[PDB]
Amino acid sequence: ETPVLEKNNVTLTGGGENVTKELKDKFTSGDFTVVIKYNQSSEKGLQALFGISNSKPGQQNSYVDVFLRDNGELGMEARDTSSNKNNLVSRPASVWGKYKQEAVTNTVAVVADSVKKTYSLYANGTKVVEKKVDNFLNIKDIKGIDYYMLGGVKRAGKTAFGFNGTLENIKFFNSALDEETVKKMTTNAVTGHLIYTANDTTGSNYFRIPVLYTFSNGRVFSSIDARYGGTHDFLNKINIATSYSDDNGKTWTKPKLTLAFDDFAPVPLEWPREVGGRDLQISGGATYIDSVIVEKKNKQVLMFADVMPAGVSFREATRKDSGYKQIDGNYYLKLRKQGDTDYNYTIRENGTVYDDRTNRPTEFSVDKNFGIKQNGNYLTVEQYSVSFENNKKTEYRNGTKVHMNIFYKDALFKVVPTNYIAYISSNDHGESWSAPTLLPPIMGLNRNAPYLGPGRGIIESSTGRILIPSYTGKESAFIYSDDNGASWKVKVVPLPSSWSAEAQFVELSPGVIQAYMRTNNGKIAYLTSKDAGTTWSAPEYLKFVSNPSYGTQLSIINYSQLIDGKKAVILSTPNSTNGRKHGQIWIGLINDDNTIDWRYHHDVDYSNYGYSYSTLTELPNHEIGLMFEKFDSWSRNELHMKNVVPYITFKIEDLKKNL
Numbered sequence: 001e002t003p004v005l006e007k008n009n010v011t012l013t014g015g016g017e018n019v020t021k022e023l024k025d026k027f028t029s030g031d032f033t034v035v036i037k038y039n040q041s042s043e044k045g046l047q048a049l050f051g052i053s054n055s056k057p058g059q060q061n062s063y064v065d066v067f068l069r070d071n072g073e074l075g076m077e078a079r080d081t082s083s084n085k086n087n088l089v090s091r092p093a094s095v096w097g098k099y100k101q102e103a104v105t106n107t108v109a110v111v112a113d114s115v116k117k118t119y120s121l122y123a124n125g126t127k128v129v130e131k132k133v134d135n136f137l138n139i140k141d142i143k144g145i146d147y148y149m150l151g152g153v154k155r156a157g158k159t160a161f162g163f164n165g166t167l168e169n170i171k172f173f174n175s176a177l178d179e180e181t182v183k184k185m186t187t188n189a190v191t192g193h194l195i196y197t198a199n200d201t202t203g204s205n206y207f208r209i210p211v212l213y214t215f216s217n218g219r220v221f222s223s224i225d226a227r228y229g230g231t232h233d234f235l236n237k238i239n240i241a242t243s244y245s246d247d248n249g250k251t252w253t254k255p256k257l258t259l260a261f262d263d264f265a266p267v268p269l270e271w272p273r274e275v276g277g278r279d280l281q282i283s284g285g286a287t288y289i290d291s292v293i294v295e296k297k298n299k300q301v302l303m304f305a306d307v308m309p310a311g312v313s314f315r316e317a318t319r320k321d322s323g324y325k326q327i328d329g330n331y332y333l334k335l336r337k338q339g340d341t342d343y344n345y346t347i348r349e350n351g352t353v354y355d356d357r358t359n360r361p362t363e364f365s366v367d368k369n370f371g372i373k374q375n376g377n378y379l380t381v382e383q384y385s386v387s388f389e390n391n392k393k394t395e396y397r398n399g400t401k402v403h404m405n406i407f408y409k410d411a412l413f414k415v416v417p418t419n420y421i422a423y424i425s426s427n428d429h430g431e432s433w434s435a436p437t438l439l440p441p442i443m444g445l446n447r448n449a450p451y452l453g454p455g456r457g458i459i460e461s462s463t464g465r466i467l468i469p470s471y472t473g474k475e476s477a478f479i480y481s482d483d484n485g486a487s488w489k490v491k492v493v494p495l496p497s498s499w500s501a502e503a504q505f506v507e508l509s510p511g512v513i514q515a516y517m518r519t520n521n522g523k524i525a526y527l528t529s530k531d532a533g534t535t536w537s538a539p540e541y542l543k544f545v546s547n548p549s550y551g552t553q554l555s556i557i558n559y560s561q562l563i564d565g566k567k568a569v570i571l572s573t574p575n576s577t578n579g580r581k582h583g584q585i586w587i588g589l590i591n592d593d594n595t596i597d598w599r600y601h602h603d604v605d606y607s608n609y610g611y612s613y614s615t616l617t618e619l620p621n622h623e624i625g626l627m628f629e630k631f632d633s634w635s636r637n638e639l640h641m642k643n644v645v646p647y648i649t650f651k652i653e654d655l656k657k658n659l
Ligand SMILES: CC(=O)N[C@H]1[C@H]([C@H](O)[C@H](O)CO)O[C@@](OC[C@H]2O[C@@H](O)[C@H](O)[C@@H](O)[C@H]2O)(C(=O)O)C[C@@H]1O
Pocket: 046, 061, 067, 075, 077, 088
């Protein structure tokens, strides 16, 4: 299959290029596929990569184009004036703008298929959207088409939507090419920046909440939320997936499911993006969400995650019950047997389930992965699948038998419907992991566990204290161990308001640490401890970040090499009052008095491009690795998008900009 027209290296500055002679009436069937490898010299304005139109007076709504906006949205229009049919199909955050101050080459494509009545758009190897439309128009359906142009749309004798950049290669086909062909044709260097991809070895179409960490041995490790029923926090099914690199981030392992329940199958789901439909959620599977990583002095690695029983949301969960009882001074996870009103049971030594009314063992036990046994044999429940049947969501028992689990909605014995924290440990730097341990009720018996601040933990250097950031909704909760992670305690710090205080730590000097965190007031706060986290100052705020009131998670790390003769920290955050956008990386130099000189910053892409949760690490060669949500993950317009969490790298010289 060969193009009706192929052109190369067309550099344009808003004026376009007429190719009417070279396309006129060549779209015989009316179907089309247009594949465009381009880079933009300026992202400003609405820009058309090509335009096929009726250019006559009064026919300004008779055209087809593919367009780009200054926020990375890719779309297409197909409009006919006299039928008054106006089709617009798009997806936000589909393309890249710039990277290290150079324009990024993207390859995008549109396919119009008359038999299916669908338009499909592709960017950098991903089919970003395919939509069936009742008012479908192919080229033959639009009346009096007479002008075909590169880099604009000719409307009433004037060039509209002028493209600024270079069309490195553009191919027009007069048929609808198949999906696999077009994915391949749009695959390029941008495609290789995705570690996790839709329907890879995780089975998930969607991801959020990346975390990077560099181990002592040189391995670069990642974890992430694999979110199956779109990108919703809740209700959903979420697993923690992981992937690692032993060549300084150049190549990564196929992702593994590292924390995952099996009450619901981990399957690729086409979550609707329409107004209304996009609010759909599943009934909820048992969930792990929001990971934190730290490597211990002895090289054992810990990973923490929040744990939610099936159907339980952060917002509706109980805040007044830890899910534990205290019996003879020991804390045991409690259970309610189906049909009881009270929690009459506890999981005690060797996972034996006791009846607390009689203080005797039952026939039941719970293994270290939370599965229930009766007389030494596993009880089972049937797994759920989710599907779409005529754009209708269905959940059903799918024929797979899995172990009954205390976190499942079908369990005979159930935990309190609240949030928990679990951790797992690895002795081989992430290749294999222990069974999970639920954190004891460190907030008290009558409070829920904290919520983790996604990213890393630290080991403070003078005491060896391990610190894990978390929050409650009104306090900071700094989880810590003074015995190399054998037992855990918490410092609870009341906050000026009800912040979603996702935090990360840095050490300024021995004993002196700061916790940087999200707030609800638009600013990034930092609290200071001069005794390795035992006591904390009142909040101070960064002067140079101004965000919306909901705020976003951040990443901050210590860096090992001197910059301008000073110890340095590296901060990643959005910085925009208009959304989760305008990602920046800031270098802060530690002054002799332990204040920070925020001396340099680098804008990650253009200012209106999306940038939400992020994670930094220092690579073994002292370059910087960044993985981030390259979209606005708060916006109701950018939910449920595929392949939007890339990994990129910077040398310090790439970052030392703007002063
Ligand atoms: C991709 C896209 O959004 N196309 C729109 C287009 C652009 O929004 C606009 O040209 C970019 O500046 O606008 C279209 O509408 C014209 C219409 O816009 C209203 O906001 C205004 O009230 C009207 O006077 C008139 O300008 C267009 O036809 O250009 C619609 C198109 O779908």
